[PDB]
């Protein structure tokens, strides 16, 4: 939870609490959350994850019926974006008592962009290409492809201090997207039950396959390079259903005795690797407990805290949640 994410979730709660507005969690990928840009989605343990892409809607529009394109293909497409985005006005977010502007009722001014209502009404009959760009179709399906239809952005440089717990500070440059809305271009349990589904999926693996998984996942703790690589390879195999490979023992564990890829095993691993993303310095506790055999103590310690506060909206809960999932799965593989 950076101060940036703290700021963007305030924006969403004040503008659309409980709606379809999504906050930007990181300042570096904010430029890919612009209107007409495409966003990928995937069901996770915590809901759904929103993945940036390098694509716009023009990249996926089937334009074969048109005759006049056979640099005009890039010129015609770029005007379709610039002409159908309206600056519908500005809005005022009052900030809670913890947030303070450096340099009274504290407020920030943000600006809205929206795809025109007229253009959206014609989105139903525009045709999408049969084959999507490889950068997306290799890791996600066509039905998880979304279009950014609305954004909120800052209008000036904003230096915001926070004392939520201190002296945490972020400097948001002008014109930075803070929140956005997506629209689907084509066409759920409780935690304990979703983890039991995960653990049930992995229990049906053979002994050797469960040790290949545990060995690969342990190498991901505190090493984001290996976790990002593992998430990419598991996603690709979930799509392709084949394998040739350095990550051969983990990917081979997703297939059953008959050689059929069990998609639940791939989703279960992906939910693990996404939960690991919610942890930062906590991954070193997990790697330590796994090393010294105190994973059960770490699990009971997380559970005890989780029961004591039942009395990233709550970022502490999200951390405890990912911790409980990560430690429970590792403990189950090591049985």
């Amino acid at each position: 939870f950076s101060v940036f994410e703290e700021i963007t979730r305030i924006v969403v709660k004040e503008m659309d609490a409980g709606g379809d507005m999504i906050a930007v969690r990181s300042l570096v990928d904010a430029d890919r959350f612009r209107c007409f840009h495409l966003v990928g989605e995937k069901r996770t343990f915590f809901g759904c994850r929103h993945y940036t892409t390098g694509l716009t809607l023009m990249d996926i529009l089937d334009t074969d019926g048109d005759k006049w394109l056979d640099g005009l293909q890039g010129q015609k497409a770029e005007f379709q974006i610039l002409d159908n985005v309206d600056s519908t006005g500005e809005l005022i977010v009052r900030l809670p008592k913890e947030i303070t502007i450096s340099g009274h009722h504290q407020k920030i001014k943000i600006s809205e962009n929206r795809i025109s209502q007229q253009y959206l009404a014609t989105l139903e009959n525009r045709k999408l290409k049969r084959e999507l760009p490889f950068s997306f179709r290799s890791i996600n399906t066509r039905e998880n492809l979304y279009l950014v239809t609305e954004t909120l952005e800052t209008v000036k440089e904003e230096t915001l201090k926070s004392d939520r717990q201190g002296q945490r500070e972020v400097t948001i440059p002008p014109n930075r997207v803070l929140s956005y809305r997506v629209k689907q271009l084509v066409f759920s349990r409780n935690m304990k039950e979703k983890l039991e589904d995960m653990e049930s999926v992995l229990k049906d693996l053979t002994e050797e396959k469960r040790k290949d998984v545990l060995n690969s996942l342990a190498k991901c703790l505190g090493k984001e390079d290996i976790r990002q690589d593992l998430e990419q390879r598991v996603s690709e195999v979930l799509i392709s259903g084949e394998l040739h490979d350095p990550d051969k023992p983990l990917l081979s564990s997703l297939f059953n005795a008959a050689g059929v890829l069990v998609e639940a095993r791939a989703k279960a691993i992906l939910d693990f690797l996404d939960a690991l993303l919610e942890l930062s310095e906590e991954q070193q506790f997990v790697a330590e407990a796994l090393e010294k055999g105190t994973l059960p103590l770490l699990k009971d310690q997380v559970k005890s805290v989780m029961e004591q506060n039942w009395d990233d909206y709550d970022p502490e809960a999200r951390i405890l949640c990912a911790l409980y999932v990560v430690v429970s799965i590792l403990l189950e593989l090591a049985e």
Binding site: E14, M15, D16, A17, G18, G19, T88, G89, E90, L91, I92, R94, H105, K107, Q117, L120, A121
Partner: protein, 233 residues
């Protein structure tokens, strides 16, 4: 009448408080009158008051100042942007006005609104009541106020941002609003029950009612009927 208006500007400029920039304002007010321009912009000049305004102007941009009141507005003003001031009352508005922006002031009342008004932004004020709404109204922001009820919604209203108020009931919805998508926001109010007018409301209506002490009963029934786009957090 150049010498006449040039005097008024001079008397206003020499009545300044130490922190103001009435010389820069004098220049912009000078070119605006002599060239008969359409946009007068005196934003970010620390002004505590404004002189008589150049007539026949179309837009008056006086945002980010210390104004406690506004002079008589030009009779054919198209747009008024007095955001982020200290105004307590807005003068009578010309019937030509289509855009009124007075956010982040201290307004407790609003004058009668002209009929050609399509944008009304009065968020972050102290309003307890809101005047009748123009028929051609399209965008309305009244959040961060102290309203308890809303007037009947016009037939062309597309966006209504009425969150962060103290509303206890919903306003009457229009029977002839046939535009594509209505986005009405009512979150963080004091609405306790849902009106019967929510039936026969098309899916063109997107309503947010989160953060509202909705009774466990009406919360239970909504939990059913949801199996108009509504969000009941």
């Amino acid at each position: 009448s150049n010498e006449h208006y040039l005097r008024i500007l001079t008397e206003w400029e020499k009545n300044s408080s130490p922190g103001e920039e009435r010389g820069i304002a004098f220049n912009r007010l000078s070119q605006c009158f002599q060239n008969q321009e359409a946009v007068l912009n005196l934003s970010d000049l620390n002004l505590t008051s404004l002189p008589e305004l150049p007539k026949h102007i179309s837009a008056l941009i006086v945002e980010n100042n210390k104004l406690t009141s506004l002079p008589k507005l030009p009779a054919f003003l198209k747009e008024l942007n007095a955001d982020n001031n200290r105004l307590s009352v807005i003068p009578e508005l010309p019937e030509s006005l289509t855009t009124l922006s007075v956010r982040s002031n201290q307004l407790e009342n609003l004058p009668v609104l002209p009929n050609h008004l399509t944008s009304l932004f009065v968020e972050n004020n102290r309003l307890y009541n809101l005047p009748a709404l123009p028929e051609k109204l399209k965008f309305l922001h009244v959040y961060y106020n102290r309203l308890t009820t809303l007037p009947d919604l016009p037939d062309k209203l597309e966006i209504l941002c009425a969150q962060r108020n103290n509303l206890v009931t919903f306003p009457q919805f229009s029977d002839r609003n046939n535009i594509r998508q209505k986005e009405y926001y009512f979150h963080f109010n004091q609405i306790t029950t849902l009106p019967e007018s929510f039936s026969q409301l098309d899916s063109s209506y997107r309503i947010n009612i989160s953060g509202n002490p909705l009774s466990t009963r009406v919360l239970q029934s909504l939990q059913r009927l949801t199996s108009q786009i509504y969000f009941s957090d």
